[model samples]
Target: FRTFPGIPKWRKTHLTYRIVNYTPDLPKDAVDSAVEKALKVWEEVTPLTFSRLYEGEADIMISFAVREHGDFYPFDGPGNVLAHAYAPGPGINGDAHFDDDEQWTKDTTGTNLFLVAAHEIGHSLGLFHSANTEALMYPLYHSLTDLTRFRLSQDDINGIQSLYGPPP
Candidate 1:
C-alpha cells in the first residue's frame, strides 16, 4: 500500500468517530455494524484505537449523501464513485462520506458497505491507494463476501504500521 505525500497520519493513537447520518438504503444497525467493523480492520492491525461517540464533533465524522455535499468533491450519480475520506488531522480531516446513490448492501449483489467503508477508513487513517491489486487499499472495488476470512495484505499492514506502528 502507498501513502499520501508527507505521510499525513493521526498523531494520537486513540480517535473518536461519529456517524453524522445514515443511508436509507440499509438498516441503521447494519450501517452501524459496518462502520464498527470497518474501523476494526485498521485497529486490529495497528496501535490505533477507535471510539464511537453519540454527540458533538468527533475526530472522524461519517455520513452518507448524494450529489453535491459540502466539500469540493461532490458525489456522482451512482456507479462511479462509492465514497471518499480525508486524511488524519483536525476539522474535516478523517471524515468519510458515502454516496447514497449506490445500493449499499451486506452481500455481493449490491455495493458492500463493509468493504467500501473499510477501504474509505483506510483513507481516513491516511492510507493511499495500493498498486497491489489484492490490497484493500486498491482503488477499484472488488466483491468481498467472507468477512470471517478477511485479512490485511502485507502491503497494507506494513504501510499502516509505518505510520502508527504495530498493535500495542
Candidate 2:
C-alpha cells in the first residue's frame, strides 16, 4: 500500500496490460513469457491477477524505448537506469517504459527481463521502494544470478498485503 500523497490503491485486483511492441533484441515469444512471468510473480502472492489485452487500452501499457518516447523522461542510452514506471493512478499510472539501448536477455548473461519486469510491475501494483535492498520493490537495480525461481520477500508481502489484504 505504498501509495503516493492522494492516489488510492487500485480498487480492483484484476488488472490488464498491453505490450506495445516487442524489442528487436529478444524473440517475440520470449518477450511475452518475460512479461507473463513477471505478472505471475505478483499473482502468486496475492489475490491480485493480470490479463493480457491484444486490443484497446490496458491498465499497464508496457513499451521499450531507446531514448525519447513521448513521456519526457528520455532514456540515457545503454546503462544507468534501465527503466521506470509511474505510480498507480488513471491514464499514465501503470505505464512502464524500458530503455531499449540495453541488451535484454533471457538469462543472467545480461540484464534479465524477468527481474526488471517484475520490479516495474511492483509499481504497477501500487508498491513503492523498500528499505530492504534485495526486495523487488527496492528503487535501485543490481544484477543478480538466481533467477532460478523468484518469490516475493517478506517486505514485499507485507507491503502488498497492507494494500490488497492477505492472499486468498
Candidate 3:
C-alpha cells in the first residue's frame, strides 16, 4: 500500500519546459524521454500536467552546462554532483541543469538520467531530501539500483503526497 501524507495540494497547472544545451554522450531524444519520464513520475501520482516547449525560453528548462553555470551550485565533474534543479519560479529558477561532464546513459552503465532527473525535479517541486534510504528524495545516489523497476519508496510517497495528494 502507498502512504500519502496529504499536505499542500498540487493541481494541473499546464506547465511547460525547455532544454538549454545538449550532451554528446546520449541522443537528444534520450534526454527528452528521460526528463518526460521524470516529470511523469510525479504527474502519475498527482493531478499535475506538463507541456513541452521545443524552442525559446520555457517555464522549466532542462540542459547540460559545465561548472559554475551562473548559479551558486557548480557541477562536479563525472561523479558527486550529477545534476541539480531549482524550484518553480522565474528565469533559471524552474530550469533543471545536468552536468554534461558525466557519462549519461539510458541504462546503469553511467549515471541514470531518469533516476537523477526525477530526484532533482522532486526538489524543484519544493520537496526536500528525505532521510529514508528507500526514498527517491534521499540525497544519496545509488548506482546499484534496478532501473527497470525503480520506484519511489513508501517514505517518498508519504513525502510527495504530503505536498500533493492522489489524483482527483
Candidate 4:
C-alpha cells in the first residue's frame, strides 16, 4: 500500500546532481560509480532522469561530512546515522550528506556506499521510510551484494510511481 501524507516530491521529472567531494575510504572513481549506480536504481523505475554536474550547485548536492558539519541533524560518529539527505526543494533541498567517520566500501565488508547512497537518494527524491523490510526505503541498513542484480520491492516501486508516475 502507498501513502503520501504531506511528503514533498519533485515537481519536475528531470533533475541534476553533483558530488561535492569524495571520501578517503574509496577511490575517486569508485565513489563516482557508486553514486551513479545508486541514482540509476530510481531512474529505472521512474520517468526521471538524473544528470551529473561538474561545477556549481545542482538540484541534488552529494557530499561527505563528519559530526556537526553544519546542518541541524549532526552525525553521531560512525555506527549510528550513517548518512542523511534532505527532501526535495530549493537551496539545500535534495542534498545528501554521508558520514565520513564510517568505513565506506564498495561491498558488504563495511558500510556499502552504494546501498547507503541509494537509500539517501531515495530520501532526496522525497521517499520516506517504508515499513516493509524488503523496501529500500526501510530505515534499517542491510548488507547487500550483487548490486548489478538488485531490485526494488513492489511497495517501493508503487510508492515512487504514485508520487512521480510510471516511466514515460
- By TM-score, the best candidate is 1
Q: Estimate each model's TM-score.
A: 0.97, 0.94, 0.87, 0.95
lDDT of 2 by residue, 1-168 (tens): 255456357889889999998898899999999999998888887898888999998999999998878887889988888988887778988899999998999987778888999989888777878888778888776777677766778888888777887778
Candidate 3's C-alpha runs over 4 A off are 1-12
lDDT of 4 by residue, 64-166 (tens): 9998888898898978899999889998989999999999998888999999999888988888889998898988987765666678888889888888988
Candidate 3 structure quality by residue, lDDT tens digits, 5-109 = 332223335678776777898998998899889999988876667888889777778888889888898988778789887765667766788998888989998
Better candidate by lDDT, 1 or 3 = 1
Give the distance in Å from residue 6's predicted Cα in candidate 1 to where it truly belongs.
1.0
lDDT of 1 by residue, 66-168 (tens): 9988999999987999999999899999999999999999777889999999999999999999999889999998776566688888999988999999987
User: How far is 145's C-alpha from truth in model 2 (Å)?
Assistant: 1.2
In model 4, which residue pairs have backbone atoms overlapping below 3 Å? Answer: none
RMSD of 1: 1.0
Q: Best candidate per lDDT, number? A: 1
Candidate 2 collision pairs:
none
Q: What C-alpha lDDT values do all the predictions have?
A: 0.91, 0.84, 0.77, 0.89
Model 1 spans > 4 angstroms off: 145-148
Candidate closer to the true structure by TM-score (higher is better), 2 or 4:
4
What's the CA RMSD for each of the models? 1.0, 1.5, 3.6, 1.5
State the lDDT at 112 in candidate 1. 92
Rank ordering of all candidates by TM-score, starting from the highest = 1, 4, 2, 3
